[PDB]
Amino acid sequence: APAPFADFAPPVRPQSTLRRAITAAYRRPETECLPPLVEAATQSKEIRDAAASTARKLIEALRGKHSGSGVEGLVQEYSLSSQEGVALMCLAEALLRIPDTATRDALIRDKIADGNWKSHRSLFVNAATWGLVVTGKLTSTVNDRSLAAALTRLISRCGEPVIRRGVDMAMRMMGEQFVTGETIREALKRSKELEEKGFSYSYDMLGEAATTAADAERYYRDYESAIHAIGKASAGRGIYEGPGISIKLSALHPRYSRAQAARVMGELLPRVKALALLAKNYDIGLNIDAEEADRLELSLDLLEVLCLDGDLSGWNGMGFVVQAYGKRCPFVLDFIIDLARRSGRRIMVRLVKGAYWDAEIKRAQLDGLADFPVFTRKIHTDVSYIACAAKLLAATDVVFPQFATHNAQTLAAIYHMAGKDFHVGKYEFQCLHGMGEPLYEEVVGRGKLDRPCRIYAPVGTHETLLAYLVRRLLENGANSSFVHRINDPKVSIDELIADPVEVVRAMPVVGAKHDRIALPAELFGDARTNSAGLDLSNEETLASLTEALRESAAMKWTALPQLATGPAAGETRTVLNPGDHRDVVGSVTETSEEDARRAVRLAADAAPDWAAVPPSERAACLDRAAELMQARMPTLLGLIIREAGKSALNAIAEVREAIDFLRYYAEQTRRTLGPGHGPLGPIVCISPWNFPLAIFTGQIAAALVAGNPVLAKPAEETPLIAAEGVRILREAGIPASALQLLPGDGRVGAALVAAAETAGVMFTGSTEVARLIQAQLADRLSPAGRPIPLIAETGGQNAMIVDSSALAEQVVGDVITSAFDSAGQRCSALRVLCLQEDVADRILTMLKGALHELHIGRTDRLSVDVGPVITSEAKDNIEKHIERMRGLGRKVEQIGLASETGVGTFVPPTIIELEKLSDLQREVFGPVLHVIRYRRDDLDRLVDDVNATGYGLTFGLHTRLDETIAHVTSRIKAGNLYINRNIIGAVVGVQPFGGRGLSGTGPKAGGPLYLGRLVTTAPVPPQHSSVHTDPVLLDFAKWLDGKGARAEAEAARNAGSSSALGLDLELPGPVGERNLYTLHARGRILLVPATESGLYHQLAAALATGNSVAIDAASGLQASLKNLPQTVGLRVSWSKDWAADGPFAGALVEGDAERIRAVNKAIAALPGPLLLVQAASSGEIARNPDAYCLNWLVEEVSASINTAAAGGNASLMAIG
């Protein structure tokens, strides 16, 4: 048996002094990066004056030949609105997908111009891109109804001539402007004109981010065939005067990442070597493009091996991009220059600013990392660029600098920095096709500056173009971009030639972070501190984590019954690693049923003393526990990895979630709890195995901070991390009498629930076990004669709907994560993928290819993607489902498992293609994705089928179309919605988490209504109000007044005002996402009245919160509701057989204690979902206007929208 963590994440090679200096700068504070860059970029007064004069001359030329674009001229000629221009270009795009030119012209003449364009996949799938072209602004989703109206209007107004102009315009841009050519031969033919003027070329076969092995093979043969064509055309011109190629490493392997470094060096490197050998034989340049920040240092390992490989000697064409917007850039250049000296290869170094800025900001915020790997002020990147250019110009004997820029100020500064001596091969400039030719026609040639420029030339069909094209249009439209400002009349030439080096030097704090971009720690501002993660791409982090993880594995972890009086004796057994039962993780002593009953009595005796600790001090304990967990995160990771079968990434997220619960409930307490919000009493917290620290901590922390002593009963599978969490909470100041730990199985849970002094239960787990607890509690009443509160958060049958406008690569990534992360052992995991029929085959092929790149095994290796299932019984239950489906004829795709999995309990990720959604009965808690197909016109029926399971936890939708978003999100019934992203997000206070139906009672964990359920009188949560009044409530109040029920009419009006139905908030979070929180009606509420006035109060509460009702017909109160307004009657039904008329979404009960007990038992016997029941006596209804609390009669819905899904971030376009 291998030692734990002995092979966790060894580096590709020992890290040299130069490599370690790169890693040290990864997230260096911006105020530390800039001073040395300012010093390096400083030039003399004479040079700065000459550079400004050169830059002014270049800018005056650019503005003096500036002409209006063809799109702007078309919009002007036909007086088009912006939406009309966008819709016209979408139509033109679709028309050009008809190959036969004469067939297209006939369709235009006889069908399109004749009105009905709809008759002949949305036309507007790519409207976000055309929106950038027409308006310069990026919209994340498409208003397809606005575009359809605009297209009808413009065709009916202008007819065939405008369509003809649109087609011809789109044909030029897509064939000549967006790309240099559709094929490499076409691009080579079009390059002759500018090569005669002194330009050179580097061709990019458009392609990146391979999803499957087949994709990577395709990109490889594209590169290989382009090298042949370029080399044949080069015909011996060499690497400086002749053309070259650019490649992206992510195109050549589907798992290009630090986590898969061994596969990268074993599988990707030989492919790059084979391409480089061919480039060497033709003597052309081969450049490795730079991608995301977490790929930089990995790419250096490939560069090093290739430059030391003797088979490539004699050739100086290997090239490499370095991004000046990155904090590591000068240290990367130090490494490359030294490698060039060691190898004797004159490495071609392309200095760029960088293409992924928006995405790097979002990623660092999501991951809770210390800082960004890029600058946050645009002028900092400019200073970085000039400083790095000085370093390169001092090293032209050993490297070939290539200065890629469209900024005339940058260009002029480098041109003068380089001085008077020049020869071809010393250095060059570079620009992008369709962006830089105007500027460099003022540079190339003996009549200008006599400096060469290489054009980066994209090659590809309309299809393969999207990702690259959006990045260019974002660059072109960003407020901070030179190419945008040059065309801004409000921007003077003096502003354009301002020297960024001197502007930065003169700022009061050199290198200060952008004022409007929050560090990841500060996402929530003054409310609370964000939890911090760990960068698993940082070699220093991986080295220290390896040591900490190994040390965690040497510890003698235990879990004991920790009563208020001290540890208790009991039956003891080992806890085994689910991925390898030979790995003993620790020992657990389980609680006897007698000691569990004893613990509740000790909790009851201690309850007054803990309630007396003021809320601010209880919240301070939670904050101290969060600090302790943050500091102990590496050790906690090691325990979670080995006890619960989690990967390192998933364990980090788990510990972050626990920290966030602690800080969120602390802050909510400080905002709400006062002397009149008395605790319930001892609360039993029963938790699941699959989030063994986060959900465990969240329930206990909420109960404790609300003033309740807690009996903590963790899942029998994962007691060790629970015991450590209790240890941390007690260290933080929670008294032993206020938090007792009771390990064991469901018997211990049931004994606690049944104990007489148990005042409340918090349950997270399976729906079937929640139903047993509901039945136990139906026997019971509080000393005040009211039901024992139960929060029961249960399973899901979670769907994702994908239409023909979604991007397959995005979909497949979010499906692989949502369905198979943690081996599908997330309550939020994707269970049913619904694919529109027209794209289903392509997406399924891509999904299956991505499935086969996953690594399944014991999770103490960074390279492992999917770990084990928790037990042999879980495995048996999952496989029985797979075999039942397999026996019914359903197609089943499974990864093959390595033999080393035999010592643990593993289930391979599985795809099952279903015929109907009713083929599924219950939640299958494992790595099993079901796939169904649907026709577009059946979308509404499909949402019905998803709702018809009775679950309502997480739900995903992938679409670009606003009409479809509005339709689906208005009809789906689930607690957590996700648009154009994965569905496993539960960020505390950002996506408050929890569902409806068979998925939960609410209120949501990590949301503002949670603490109020754990006290006898609920406070008013922050931001909890609504100015909207339910109109049926208003009609009912008028009816009450007409009947003479004046006091009840006033109570009804008061309920209408007090209701928070219609609350609609946006919660603070990371950039590039919109996180929304709304209060809706729950549904149909069962009313069990005893008196006429009680019925009127119950009806008012239910209607004020937007619900319909079913009224118990055995009440005999039918005569009390005569002559209702039709609007109210529509919401009212009478029920003789409650079980026939469900499912209900809650219940209101009136009666004395024994009537409430009898009704509670009858309600618990109803089939289906657990009901949140509220009960009151007739006297309580008369005395207390809040006898029925309106908090529990609305339904919380969280929605998370990825607003960067279209390829960039519109808001950050105006941030520089």
Ligand SMILES: Cc1cc2nc3c(=O)[nH]c(=O)nc-3n(C[C@H](O)[C@H](O)[C@H](O)COP(=O)(O)OP(=O)(O)OC[C@H]3O[C@@H](n4cnc5c(N)ncnc54)[C@H](O)[C@@H]3O)c2cc1C
């Ligand atoms: C031929 C060529 C090849 C290229 N290859 C690559 C490549 O392989 N990998 C890659 O990542 N990029 C690459 N780029 C760069 C990228 O695609 C953009 O073209 C370039 O960053 C624009 O810089 P500029 O000097 O033209 O314009 P400018 O307007 O001077 O600079 C714009 C740049 O500033 C940066 N920026 C904007 N806002 C901020 C901010 N708030 N804080 C900090 N920085 C900010 C961004 O990098 C942005 O692109 C290449 C560029 C060219 C011309």
Ligand SMILES: NC(=O)c1ccc[n+]([C@@H]2O[C@H](COP(=O)([O-])OP(=O)(O)OC[C@H]3O[C@@H](n4cnc5c(N)ncnc54)[C@H](O)[C@@H]3O)[C@@H](O)[C@H]2O)c1
């Ligand atoms: N809605 C959410 O937020 C959420 C979150 C995570 C997991 N879950 C659900 O939890 C399930 C997986 O977790 P699990 O396997 O640990 O659930 P489980 O129902 O098997 O057990 C959960 C806890 O209940 C206890 N238990 C079992 N029988 C009991 C009984 N008769 N009386 C009292 N307690 C009893 C168990 O010991 C355990 O501590 C999944 O269905 C998952 O969907 C829901």
Ligand SMILES: O=C(O)C1SCCS1
């Ligand atoms: O494709 C991109 O976004 C960059 S890589 C080389 C050109 S700019």
Ligand SMILES: [Mg+2]
């Ligand atoms: Mg169980």
